[PDB]
Amino acid sequence: VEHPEFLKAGKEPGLQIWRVEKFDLVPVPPNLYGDFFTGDAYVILKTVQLRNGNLQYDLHYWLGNECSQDESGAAAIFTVQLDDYLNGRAVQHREVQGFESSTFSGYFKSGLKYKKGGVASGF
Amino acid sequence: VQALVVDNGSGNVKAGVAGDDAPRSVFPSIVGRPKNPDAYVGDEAQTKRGILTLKYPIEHGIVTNWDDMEKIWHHTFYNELRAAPEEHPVLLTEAPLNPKGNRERMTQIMFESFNVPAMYVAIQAVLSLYSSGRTTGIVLDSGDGVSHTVPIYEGYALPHAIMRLDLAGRDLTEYLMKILHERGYGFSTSAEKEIVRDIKEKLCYIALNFDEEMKTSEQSSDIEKSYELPDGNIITVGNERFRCPEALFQPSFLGKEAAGIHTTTFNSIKKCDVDIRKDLYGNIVLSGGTTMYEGIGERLTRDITTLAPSTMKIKVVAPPERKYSVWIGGSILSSLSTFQQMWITKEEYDES
Ligand SMILES: Nc1ncnc2c1ncn2[C@@H]1O[C@H](COP(=O)(O)OP(=O)(O)O)[C@@H](O)[C@H]1O
Ligand SMILES: [Ca+2]
Ligand SMILES: [Ca+2]
Ligand SMILES: [K+]
Ligand SMILES: [K+]
Ligand SMILES: [Mg+2]
């Protein structure tokens, strides 16, 4: 509830992407949105503005084929914690490299792309 | 400040430091006290079984001897980790369906006997699901003393749907000891049980179809595999290699009326409402030492597929390191930048 990135989460309609880095949630430079390191795990919050004026939330955690167990575990856990912080109103989606839902693919106009490498494991 | 992670197993305690990819201390959950009078724990107690009475303070994953459990935790902190418990946050695990009164007793002991500055109690199966990179799934956790099927949705276990089996690894060890009498082996003592446990782990496997495996194993000696006893004698085991773990699927082999592990997983999923069952069937996650048998995943997939509606997509996940997936999940969780917001501090507890 006190994590700076939680405080920024879901305030406005849009797309927020964090990468797991050494057991923390670190915002992805917006210039890199759509390109995912296959060695890493990410958390993605899509916020949509409804006619109600309320906000709908969809949380995706994306797991790269070579990401390490601390990164995919942390991605799952952070997804739960962000949902809790959002009063439980996010729908959670597990996204595996190369088998992503069409909803998640649809967030990126240039399509999903993958890059070799990644940030080092916390383990 | 680095948290200590302790997984309180019926058979073995797993202990280490947050951020490590595996426990640095694994030792048997055994307390020995002099026969004619001091307490000895773990491996020390097994080597002095001649002068000690050995007890298991955790029965079926539930702490039932609190004085001896305190000896185990003391041993963990002082003799295994060499860590001051009063200077580290501690993540402790608990069994699914652990009564709230038990959790509160463990909390009282941590805060008032060991003076831990902060602690968190996590459900074992939930930690295993996180360690597999999932927030939704059903965890089949089979240890030494208890097996549980634990549905979990979006990070939280569904208590009404958890199901519990007293059938676990220790029963299979005892069953192997029994059926080895057909070949003339008389393992009976506590030390011989340890040897048989090792025979079980080295040579057993789960048949894809039990009846067919009985037939093919009868037609030649290819089934037979050897194992060198510590006294240098060689033992040969045949169809016992797959008949022993077959009890997981047919508890009647043990004189039990209970449902096997495939039926239990199916009943556990059925307790959850229809709209989330597909996510559970597609995320059956194996956890714990007694899920380590070769062939378990293919066999479980067959048997749950038979039982479940054919619209369901069955996926059994067998993580290579699943023997310690509980501890690894605790290591991840307690390394997170948000862990300090989840724990209970001594000051809060002492003023509650
Ligand atoms: N490779 C293996 N094959 C079959 N059983 C195993 C294997 N490794 C460990 N086990 C069994 O798993 C049990 C211990 O598992 P564990 O999950 O540590 O239990 P607990 O958490 O209750 O102490 C023991 O019965 C042990 O013999
Ligand atoms: Ca990485
Ligand atoms: Ca939710
Ligand atoms: K267990
Ligand atoms: K079926
Ligand atoms: Mg266990």
Going from the C-alpha of A17 to that of each of A1, A64, B341, the distances in angstroms are 18, 14, 22
Position of tokens 């009326």?
B257
Q: What are the helix and strand counts (H, E) for chain A?
A: 3, 7
**E-strand stretches of B90-144:** 90-94, 118-123, 137-142
Farthest-apart Cα atoms in chain B, separation = 70
Q: Which of B299, B263, B311, B265 is nearest to B285 (CA)?
A: B265
Going from the C-alpha of A15 to that of each of A56, A90, B228, B241, B262, the distances in angstroms are 12, 14, 61, 54, 41
The b-or-e profile of A27-40 (16+ CB within 10 A means b, else e) is ebeeeebbebbbbb
User: What is the per-residue DSSP string for A75-96?
Assistant: HHHHHHHHHHHTTT-EEEEEEE
- Spatial separation of the C-alpha atoms in residues A78 and B118, rounded to whole Å: 21
- Residue closest via CA to ligand 1's atom 8 equals B289
C-alpha radius of gyration, chain A, whole number:
14
Q: How far apart, in Å, do the first and last CA atoms of chain B sit?
A: 24
Experimentally determined by? X-ray
Count CB neighbours of B37 within 10 A: 5
Q: Which protein residues have a CB closer than 5 Å to ligand 5 (ion)?
A: B 310
Name the DSSP class of A121.
Answer: P
Per the DSSP assignment, residues forming a β-bridge with B93 are B122
CA of residue B26 to ligand 6 center, whole Å: 12
CA of residue B347 to ligand 1 center, whole Å: 38
CA of residue A75 to ligand 2 center, whole Å: 12
Strand, coil or helix: what is A49? strand
Count CB neighbours of B214 within 10 A: 15
- Spatial separation of the C-alpha atoms in residues B133 and B212, rounded to whole Å: 36
Q: B338 and A3 in contact by Cβ < 8 A?
A: yes
For each of the domains in chain A, give its residue range(s) and CATH number, in order of start: 1-123 (3.40.20.10)
Q: Which of B301, B293, B314 is nearest to B246 (CA)?
A: B293
Is A71 annotated for ligand binding?
yes
**Documented resolution in Å:** 1.9
* Inter-chain contacts counted by CB atoms under 8 A, chains A and B: 79
CA of residue A91 to ligand 3 center, whole Å: 5
Q: Is B320 on the interface with A (CB under 8 A)?
A: no
- Compute the half-sphere exposure of residue B87: CA atoms within 13 Å on the CB side of its CA: 6
The 3-class secondary structure across B51-62, one letter per residue, is CEEEECCEECCE
- Spatial separation of the C-alpha atoms in residues B151 and A67, rounded to whole Å: 25
Contact residues of ligand 1, CB 6 A cut-off? B 9-12, 143-145, 169-170, 173, 197, 200-201, 288-290, 292-293, 323
Which residue out of B323, B327, B328 has the highest number of ligand 1 atoms within 8 Å of its CB and is therefore the one to mutate?
Answer: B323
Q: Which amino acid is at B21?
A: D
The 3-class secondary structure across B24-64, one letter per residue, is CEEEECCEEEECCCCCEECHHHHHCCCCEEEECCEECCEEC
- Spatial separation of the C-alpha atoms in residues B79 and B77, rounded to whole Å: 6
Closest chain B C-alpha to A108 CA, distance in angstroms: 24
C-alpha radius of gyration, chain B, whole number:
21
Residues in A lying within 8 Å of B, measured between beta carbons: 1-3, 6, 23-25, 41, 61, 63, 69-70, 72-81, 83-84, 88, 92, 94, 122-123
- Spatial separation of the C-alpha atoms in residues B155 and B139, rounded to whole Å: 12
Query: Given phi > 0 = left and psi -120 to 50 = alpha, else beta, which region is B19?
Result: left
- Spatial separation of the C-alpha atoms in residues A98 and A64, rounded to whole Å: 9
For each of the domains in chain B, give its residue range(s) and CATH number, in order of start: 1-124+326-352 (3.30.420.40), 125-166+259-325 (3.30.420.40), 167-258 (3.90.640.10)
